[PDB]
């Protein structure tokens with residue numbers, strides 16, 4: 001069944017199109033970032049975060065001049081300003097600290113946080129060692145859909161003999177489709 | 182450079198530990214769900230969403246009895262109730278509609294939404310055809326960190342001759358580590 005130690009930590013925060021992660025030593029080493037830089041790695045931007053000029057690989061240092069060194073502290077600052085439409089971001093990028101403005105026409109809202117996915121007891125760690133697995137992962141069967149939908153293969157349909165072919169050439173139609181004739 | 186058509190749609194919403202996706206025909210077929218079920222597939226739960234009883238594979242049908250058939254409409258309802266501490270969820274699971282209660286001690290907050298990742302022009306679609314790529318993806322180089330950090334290999338360090346071995350046996354130390362001697 002589903003085991004969750006007292007203390008499963010946050011792994012990501014989602015805020016206005018940005019995905020923010022703790023900036024570990026492992027990431028600092030992987031990304032050739034100063035080893036004493038403190039902040040949150042932005043590994044993805046889209047939507048209002050993309051519009052602000054925020055980029056994947058930026059390190060988020062402060063929101064409204066309040067330092068954010070942990071996802072908890074990021075969430076706290078977003079909660080403070082959640083009903084505002086605009087917030088300042090200080091971002092470390094290739095050596096310079098930039099200020100960027102983040103805005104949404106209704107309200108910025110609370111950053112929504114998540115833990116690392118639930119794992120099976122016999123799951124293979126896809127990353128370097130980071131400590132005891134239950135520090136970061138629930139252990140169980142249910143935390144996400146399996147078989148992963150991403151690997152479920154759908155049958156091509158039946159087709160009527162002489163149907164126009166909507167995809168590129170793939171071979172004789174009957175290799176893949178029941179022919180309704 | 183970075184091309185974004187007028188109309189890049191939402192792909193996911195993050196709310197209190199749940200990840201919600203539009204429930205497409207493709208997913209309905211993959212998951213053997215009724216083809217006329219309307220709602221949002223929950224593909225991941227953790228944190229307060231896990232505590233409510235919400236499970237990966239659940240379909241979110243309503244929040245506070247307001248139907249949510251699209252991520253926009255989900256976000257709208259969460260915005261309505263963002264300062265509340267509790268909200269009702271109606272969930273389709275294996276044929277039954279359940280009501281679940283979602284709570285956070287401070288406030289539930291706005292669901293934070295994202296688009297599908299930015300792609301290169303020559304990227305290979307990892308999914309079935311779903312229409313023109315620019316309906317769902319920005320096209321460019323920057324939307325996320327590449328080389329993907331997940332595939333960057335870190336060198337094992339130098340080690341002092343006779344250091345205790347913290348990992349299992351992997352072979353002669355010098356195969357992998359500079360020996361400080």
Ligand code: HEC
Nearest residue numbers: 156157159163164165166167170171172173175176309310
């Ligand atoms: C011989 C020339 C044909 C014809 C006339 C068609 N097919 Fe295929 N088909 C395949 C797959 C995986 C799909 C799913 C769509 C996708 O993501 O590519 C399809 C789809 C079709 C359709 C549309 C189905 C629908 O109801 O919308 C039609 C009309 C169609 N095909 C006709 C796979 C294959 C193959 C596997 C190697 C082969 C061979 C073919 N198709 C061949 C043809």
Ligand code: HEC
Nearest residue numbers: 128129337338340344345346347348351352353354356357
């Ligand atoms: C011969 C018995 C040895 C000894 C004494 C050690 N190693 Fe390794 N090592 C390897 C990798 C990929 C790591 C990173 C940690 C991880 O995620 O597994 C390590 C780490 C170490 C350390 C700690 C490094 C640090 O500064 O914290 C130490 C003390 C250490 N090793 C000693 C990889 C390899 C190998 C690749 C096949 C081989 C062989 C070894 N290690 C062998 C040994």
Ligand code: HEC
Nearest residue numbers: 011116117119123124125126127130131132133135136137
């Ligand atoms: C945090 C300090 C972690 C510890 C300790 C462990 N894992 Fe982990 N894991 C972590 C994160 C943040 C992620 C997401 C991807 C990333 O590296 O950023 C992962 C991922 C996994 C996965 C894949 C899960 C999935 O995609 O569904 C597995 C199977 C996994 N981790 C296993 C694992 C094991 C066996 C561990 C201990 C021996 C372990 N992890 C430790 C964060 C952390």
Ligand code: HEC
Nearest residue numbers: 192297298300304305306307308311312313314316317318
């Ligand atoms: C929405 C209706 C989509 C259309 C049309 C296309 N893609 Fe897509 N893509 C979409 C989603 C929601 C996702 C995430 C995973 C999932 O299937 O749920 C994807 C993923 C990709 C990826 C991987 C991106 C990454 O992990 O960084 C690629 C490379 C990708 N899609 C390519 C692609 C191409 C070439 C398309 C048109 C011919 C295309 N996609 C259409 C949603 C949508």
